[PDB]
Amino acid sequence: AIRKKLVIVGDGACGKTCLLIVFSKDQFPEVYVPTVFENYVADIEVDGKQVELALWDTAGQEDYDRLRPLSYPDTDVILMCFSIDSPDSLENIPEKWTPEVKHFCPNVPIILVGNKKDLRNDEHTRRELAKMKQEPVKPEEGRDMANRIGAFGYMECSAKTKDGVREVFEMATRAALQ
């Protein structure tokens, strides 16, 4: 097996920690959802190729501009996350997260991931967002942002139901192998 490294980036409320936890355990924890994620090395076989994929979170490093880049050396694939229940997290993608990743990870494929897709048809979410003249992120809005920033691709998932989670990490592995 070949070793590859994945780093997930995005705002504090984007769901990146939950996404790594659910994938690494293959389950949404029923008793306790951990606050933090240390690291993990997933055994993944995609399109006949065996890879050891090391997983890293940047949660907690958002306000520390000199500590945060230390997570980037030798990254093979970036997952750039936003939350579908937060159009504000999508807005910070092109002029905050994107130039940073392009500087420290030149030529590394970026996959733009819309997390919490289960909240797109949640009445409580739609009511809270309507108070700030907002609505859940539309699938075309996610695709257009991914197109704009030069992302390798656009994907959606729900850590809560696990839908789309395996497909995100299998595609990230394929991107890391190119």
Binding site: P29, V31, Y32, P34, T35, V36, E38, N39, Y40, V41, A54, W56, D57, A59, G60, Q61, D63, Y64, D65, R66, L67, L70, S71, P73, D74
Partner: protein, 245 residues
């Protein structure tokens, strides 16, 4: 880690660690508070373990088996003895607070009601100054350590055999040299996340809510000072590239 502490922190949560008859005696809010305190101690036990792999398995093994040029092992593992001293002491304090809280006749049933004071002590005074000085040095030497590792692995056959040998066991799967260095650098930014969630469930006692609020403030001040004190060292960097930073 030692077997006694590994077994005490084997369960996925505090609610699964204690006996069910003991869990049933507490309110939901106390269980939520204890689950996060348990996660803080469990991750501190693993962080000390990462430091022992670095000092004992890698560093000492290279000194005792390989013929590396002087100053090469220090370059691969900067400040590891100092970091091990800070965290082993902090872990000792957390584990003694848990031990004093155990019910008589039990080695697993406890409730920690007063964490805030311990966190204020760790993140203030000389221990905070030592943590700030050590992480500012470690994090400024992080990129150099990774590049030195990659150079040695690519060009030294005996170094490559040593690494492949000691990292072959499945219990070392997440703990190769580069993975340990990033695990240590990332440890300090996990503290505010853990402290904020403990604070969310510690409103029942006003003195505890105030103590955790003070501790959260101190950890953030330490992180800001460390972040402002970092500048990556690079082997063979010329003075002109440094003063034109």
């Amino acid at each position: 880690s030692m077997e006694m502490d590994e077994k005490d922190f084997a369960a996925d949560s505090w609610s699964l660690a204690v006996d069910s008859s003991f869990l049933q005696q507490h309110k939901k809010e106390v269980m939520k508070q204890q689950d996060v305190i348990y996660e803080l101690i469990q991750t501190e036990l693993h962080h000390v373990r990462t430091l022992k792999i670095m000092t004992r398995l890698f560093r000492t093994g290279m000194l005792e088996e390989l013929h590396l040029e002087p100053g090469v092992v220090q370059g691969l593992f900067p400040c590891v003895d100092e970091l091990s001293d800070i965290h082993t002491r902090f872990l000792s304090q957390l584990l003694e607070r848990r031990r004093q809280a155990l019910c008589p006749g039990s080695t697993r049933n406890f409730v920690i009601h007063r964490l805030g004071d311990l966190l204020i002590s760790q993140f203030s005074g000389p221990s905070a100054e030592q943590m700030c000085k050590t992480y500012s040095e470690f994090c400024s030497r992080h990129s150099k350590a990774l590049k030195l590792y990659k150079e040695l692995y690519a060009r030294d056959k005996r170094f490559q055999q040593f690494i492949r040998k000691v990292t072959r066991p499945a219990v070392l799967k997440r703990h190769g040299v580069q993975e340990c260095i990033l695990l240590v650098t990332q440890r300090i930014t996990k503290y505010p996340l853990l402290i904020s969630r403990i604070l969310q469930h510690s409103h029942g006692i006003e003195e505890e809510r105030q103590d955790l609020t003070t501790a959260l403030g101190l950890v953030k001040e330490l992180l800001s000072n460390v972040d402002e004190g970092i500048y990556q060292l690079e082997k063979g960097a010329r003075l002109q590239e440094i003063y034109n930073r």
